[PDB]
């Protein structure tokens, strides 16, 4: 799955490999799968792009 | 409405009964004006054919092909066409026609077909699974057999792998036998790939020489060059007609267009892939094709 | 018994012609097809030509018009005419024999003849 | 994106129509996806198939 | 007649970026205001395209593979590049293809040429020098046509060989950039389809010497290789491909 | 049987997934339900069918 903002905004993308461990494929391990290209932050915001298992992505670079 | 609702009493309301569609008034056939006969006499009536391992390929293009003298000739014992009916061969315009000529024995004529196995299909001449064209074969015992034995015709006996479709192997290479190399005489003596057919006229049917010509086509992907004898009709504007442009059949109204076609470009296709515009032969003009009026009654 | 013997080899000038002979003894020369094969030092075997009882001669597509295979059946012999000799034709030549009614097994072989070309 | 609920319905209906139109281009294992080509190329015993 | 060129300067070939070049029309069908997905032998976007020079002393006529297809770009002024050689062994054993564009016409011949080690044309300061092959014995196909042709001219060609057909696609672009490939998009129209029916694995660029030894005119060319992939092409209201997307380049374009 | 409504949904979803898995073991009139067996036992003209 490709997580992106609008192409009017930016061309940066993140890749989610669903149900795939990160050792079998900015690399973060979620319960949904392995997310590559998103910087995991400790802050909590509203959900902009849903990833799953409580993980959401947003553009501010792409953060998860 | 009574027939549609299956009742003799119809209640008040609106009922969808059928679909009105205007029918075409006349058929227009447009073919290239060119009138050059195709040299089938140089293919079928040739004095010499090459062997099946080195089969002869002739490209036939830019001519009018009269197929009706082929099927109605009683000389051909086998006339089997795959992907096209032989009667309809006059009505279609082809491109990239290939004539493949060779000589094989009698019971191997069944091996000139898609999906067959044998020595000829694997190592000599392979037809693809998606083959469109015609296989024509006739007995030639009184030309290709000599009383001492004719040896001008060869077939490859063994290859390391099966051939690709329409692949020619004229390469004659010494090959090994197994567990001893071909390092001279010293090992197991080295087998030769090409064996000659034993053609004598006293041989029974099944061993006798049969001449095979395989015609292979491509179905309307480029500006076509090989077309049947059909006479080109005049063009009519703004009327529902059932047209035939170089083998492309259909129904619609032909109108003037404002689509700036590039010189290579001939026709146009919609999302459904049905043709929406066409370039007519002989006059090179671009005619838009709009489907005839239809709707619900 | 079955035997193939060859003759005609030697050390010859390049461009001079050669006539290599393959005499057969012990078997009837009909119903068998005869091959000419050569091999260079440091190189593998290279097939030259085939000839049958009809007189149909088949050559290697790699080399053209250099050789000419000529069968003769009155004295059970086979001749090769080689014309316009190049420097790379230094080779050991072999005469081979196949049965027309089976697989292409070449059965017995000639012992071979040596052709050396130099200036 | 205020009116996304109506636009979603419009997009779904248009996309369903586009897919239904696109499905005519598929031959489903036949020699061609065009009926006129089959009717002009083959005899009725195999054109029927 | 063959002539060895022994005044070359040793230099490795260069590499540069393809950007979004090498797109050709995949078929002969008109399409307008549509987005069409096609799977064909295309040049990948932002690929590593090999750069060869002709400058004085550089004269780049190497032996290059053909592979599945060749994109040939030319930043040309004063008409040095004249044609191409295609084949497998480039001798009389196999059958080879000759494309030349001399001062009069464009000639395509399929013959068994015994090619020279350094095939070339020549201009005297008039064209009076032609050393490409030493013999031509068995010729099957001949085709004489119209002339196809700071760096001022950009020539893009796409050479493909499928099913015995050699497809040449061409585009001519007026540019004013000095050294590299301009960054932009230009769809290559099909130029010619040749029924050559021969095996091609190797190709050669033909250049022209300048004589007044020899002098090489200022020219530069680029060789890229086609791969089977999918593009999303955009057709405008005039039927011209104005933009393209490489489906396997990055996840955004995917 | 207090929470039967949620258990019915869970059972229906699991049973539908199990049925979709078990449909792979059916040959649907072919010689075998395994594609590899068909590709290894038959030539491509009949293996295609
Ligand atoms: C130009 O140079 C090439 C490469 O050095 C020459 O090709 C060689 O020529 C010699 C002499 O006949 C042969 O023995 C070699 O086998 C050739 N090499 C190859 C790879 O074929 C070529 O002959 C030179 N041109 C001229 C006119 O002499
Ligand atoms: C071959 O010759 C026969 C002899 O009359 C003729 O009837 C036939 O039409 C010829 N075939 C072709 C293809 O010319
Ligand atoms: C015949 O068709 C060609 C196109 O193939 C065209 O150029 C030519 O003008 C036509 N001739 C006539 C008399 O219509
Ligand atoms: C192109 O290839 C060369 C060598 O093959 C390599 O050094 C260079 O980094 C490559 N360039 C790109 C952009 O990949
Ligand atoms: C083309 O030539 C190459 C090498 O010259 C060879 O490996 C390949 O098999 C040839 N292909 C055909 C179809 O002849
Ligand atoms: C161009 O090449 C053709 C083909 O051989 C030849 O007939 C013609 O004379 C050449 N013209 C010049 C100017 O060399
Ligand atoms: C090719 O040319 C050579 C020499 O000119 C000739 O011996 C040979 O027969 C030719 N090949 C064919 C198929 O005509
Ligand atoms: C299409 O062609 C017209 C001229 O007929 C031109 O005005 C228009 O700008 C063209 N479209 C584009 C996108 O360039």
Author numbering:
A (entry chain A): 596 to 620, 641 to 675, 691 to 694
B (entry chain C): 299 to 595
C (entry chain H): 1 to 119
D (entry chain A), F (entry chain B): 943 to 991
E (entry chain A): 14 to 69, 77 to 145, 153 to 176, 185 to 247, 257 to 298
Question: What does the original paper state about this entry?
Answer:
SARS-CoV-2 utilizes a trimeric spike glycoprotein for attachment to the host cell receptor angiotensin-converting enzyme 2 (ACE2) and for the subsequent cell entry step which involves the fusion of host cell and viral membranes. Given its crucial role in the viral replicative cycle, the spike protein represents an important therapeutic target and is a critical antigen in host immune responses. All emerging variants contain defining mutations within their spike proteins, with multiple mutations clustering within the receptor-binding domain (RBD) impacting both ACE2 binding and antibody neutralization escape, while mutations within the highly antigenic loops in the N-terminal domain (NTD) across these variants reduce antibody neutralization. Given the rapidly changing mutational and antigenic landscape of the SARS-CoV-2 spike protein, a structural understanding of spike protein mutational effects and the discovery of broadly neutralizing epitopes is of importance.
We next determined the cryo-EM structure of VH ab6 bound to the WT spike at 2.57 Å, showing that ab6 binds to the RBD in both the up and down positions, via a unique binding mode. Local refinement of the down RBD bound by VH ab6 enabled visualization of the ab6-RBD interface at 3.21 Å and revealed that the ab6-RBD interaction is dominated by contacts with the ab6 beta-sheet scaffold, which wraps around the RBD, extending this large interface to include its CDR2 and CDR3 loops but leaving the CDR1 loop free. This scaffold-mediated interaction necessitates a near perpendicular angle of approach for ab6 relative to the RBD, which likely can only be accommodated by a single VH within a bivalent fusion construct. Thus, the unusual angle of approach and dominance of scaffold-mediated contacts may account for the lower potency of the VH-Fc ab6 construct relative to VH ab6. The CDR1 and CDR3 loops of ab6 occupy positions that result in clashes with ACE2 upon superposition with an ACE2-bound RBD, with the CDR3 region directly competing with the amino terminal helix of ACE2 for RBD binding contacts, while the CDR1 loop poses a steric clash with the second helix of ACE2 without making RBD contacts. To confirm the ACE2 competitive nature of ab6 we employed competition ELISA and competitive SPR experiments. Both experiments demonstrate the ability of ab6 to compete with ACE2 for spike protein binding. Here, we present an antibody fragment (ab6) with neutralization activity against multiple variants (Alpha, Beta, Gamma, Delta, Kappa, Epsilon, and Omicron) and report its epitope within the RBD using cryogenic electron microscopy (cryo-EM). This antibody epitope is remote from most VoC mutations, explaining its ability to confer pan-variant neutralization.
